[PDB]
């Protein structure tokens, strides 16, 4: 009596710690053979958040042709390197990996992924495989041919160039990225040609595209039911504590039910958030990364003082609208959308008017070093 909806979703169970950190693509987009060959996912690094001003183009809206302010998330996306290919055969027990073909040479950062102590090891990871590649170059072609004959699904092995980021970790992140497009033979040919080659973010995604972001959320440790599940605080008078659930079950079933809120792990969980819109695909080689057609000031996408706990973004980046799972510097998986988008909100072209680059280490008031120097004039340190 006095009904209320249950607290939290039974679809996100169990609330254990994720068995991974990277962020796993659970489902790739349906393959269309009529399209050209392309990648369906990319790996980036969460650099930080800022906000933009843009003019809204939404007829029928009170804010049509008016300025809106929006929080955005900046993900640093240097080009990934294709290092291999995996073929999967359709079977009555699911997809099965038939075989995996690697590039002749693998860089050190990807080879660090195969070790817990790369430095102390003998660095013997693909040394015998590499010799096979340069003996006759015939077992490589045979393995690729078998993927063409069998293997309805083809995925490239691609790794990040984490050394180009300011991260202290040297071990690169490696993932299977499904190749969608025309024909299994063309997938394998495309993959072989990209061995040891870079694929960059603008060849995967485009401006205004709607994508999904997959990552592991911020760790929270344990939490009681009040914060883990949102249960009501018990009264001040409650003996033996109030941050709990008063009644965790009836008589009969003489057992605690799985649907009752319990204290436990409250973070570090795997989530795929849908419908993040790409507001900008920045280029790491141009000094007007954060400039607009209305803000001509030559500035890049790094706030004053650098991204807090990240550093300077010197590579390509994406400027998704809103929030993403996980903390600054966690690797995030960007995936092509499984849905079709025809709504006006999804289809509207996005043209930014201004990107904030003030310090996020406080109440920063200057967008650029030059603006700070002009407003304040000269200081005791500036003169000498």
């Amino acid at each position: 009596k006095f009904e209320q909806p249950r607290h939290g979703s039974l679809g996100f169970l169990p609330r254990k710690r994720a068995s991974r950190q990277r962020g796993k693509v659970k489902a790739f987009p349906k393959d269309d053979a009529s399209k050209p060959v392309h990648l369906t996912a990319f790996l980036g690094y969460k650099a930080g958040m800022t906000h933009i001003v843009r003019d809204l183009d939404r007829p029928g809206s009170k804010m049509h042709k008016r300025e809106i302010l929006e929080a955005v998330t900046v993900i640093e996306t240097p080009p990934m390197v294709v290092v291999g290919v995996v073929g999967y055969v359709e079977t009555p027990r699911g997809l099965r990996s038939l075989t995996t073909v690697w590039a002749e040479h693998l860089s050190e950062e990807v080879k660090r992924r195969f070790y817990k102590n790369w430095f102390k090891s003998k660095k013997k990871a693909f040394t015998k495989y590499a010799k096979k590649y340069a003996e006759s170059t015939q077992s490589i072609n045979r393995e690729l041919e078998r993927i063409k004959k069998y293997c309805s699904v083809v995925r490239v092995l691609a790794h990040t160039q984490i050394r180009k980021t300011p991260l202290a970790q040297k071990k690169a992140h490696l993932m299977e990225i499904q190749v969608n497009g025309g024909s299994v033979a063309d997938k394998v040919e495309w993959a072989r040609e990209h061995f040891e080659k870079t694929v960059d973010i603008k060849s995967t995604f485009e401006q205004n595209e709607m994508i999904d972001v997959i990552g592991v959320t911020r760790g929270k440790g344990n939490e009681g039911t009040t914060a883990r599940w949102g249960t009501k605080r018990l009264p001040r008078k409650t003996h033996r504590g109030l941050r709990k659930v008063a009644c965790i079950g009836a008589w009969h079933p003489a057992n605690v039910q799985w649907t009752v809120a319990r204290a436990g792990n409250a973070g570090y969980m795997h989530r795929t958030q849908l419908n993040s819109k790409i507001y900008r695909i920045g280029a790491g080689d141009d000094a007007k990364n954060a400039s607009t057609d209305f803000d001509a000031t030559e500035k890049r996408i790094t706030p004053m003082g650098g991204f807090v706990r990240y550093g300077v973004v010197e590579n390509d980046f994406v400027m998704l609208n809103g929030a993403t799972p996980g903390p600054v510097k966690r690797v995030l998986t960007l995936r092509k959308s499984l849905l079709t988008h025809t709504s006006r909100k999804a289809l509207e072209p996005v043209s930014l008017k201004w990107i904030d680059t003030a310090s996020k280490f406080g109440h920063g008031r200057f967008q650029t070093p030059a603006e700070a120097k002009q407003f304040l004039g000269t200081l005791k340190k500036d003169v000498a």
Binding site: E3, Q4, H51, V53, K62, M63, R66, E67, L69, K232
Partner: protein
């Protein structure tokens, strides 16, 4: 409902039992919020109002004729800061409303003090009697 269109979500500042100034010359001074129109169902949650919202109120201080009865009113100012779609967080010095009939027509004829833009766009009778808007 059927004011002039729609209103964006605004931080609610005036729950039930809140008392706000009467910003009009209807003879009232002390609107006491009893209910908020459009409030759905949520256990233990108090109905609460923001600027532009129609509420039901009683008059606690003012002309004896206006008291002891429930009347509609519109919130025109609030102290809790809310966020405009252009990213501005704004707030007023006080909480005020004006007595209206269900259609939204003002019982009084003049409004003292500023009036929120959200209230003005929704209710043209309030906009006609408003002085400075925002």
């Amino acid at each position: 409902g059927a004011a002039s269109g729609t209103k964006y979500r605004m931080t609610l500042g005036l729950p039930v039992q809140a008392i706000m100034n009467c910003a009009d010359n209807s003879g009232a001074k002390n609107l006491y919020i009893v209910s908020v129109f459009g409030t759905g169902a949520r256990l233990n949650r108090l109905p609460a109002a923001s600027c532009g919202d129609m509420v039901l109120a009683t008059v606690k201080k003012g002309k004896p004729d206006l008291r002891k009865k429930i009347m509609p009113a519109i919130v025109v100012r609030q102290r809790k800061a809310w966020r405009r779609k252009d990213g501005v967080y704004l707030y007023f010095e006080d909480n005020a409303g004006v007595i209206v009939n269900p259609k939204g027509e003002m019982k009084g004829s003049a409004i003292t003090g500023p009036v929120a833009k959200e209230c003005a766009d929704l209710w043209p009778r309030i906009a006609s009697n408003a002085g400075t808007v925002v």
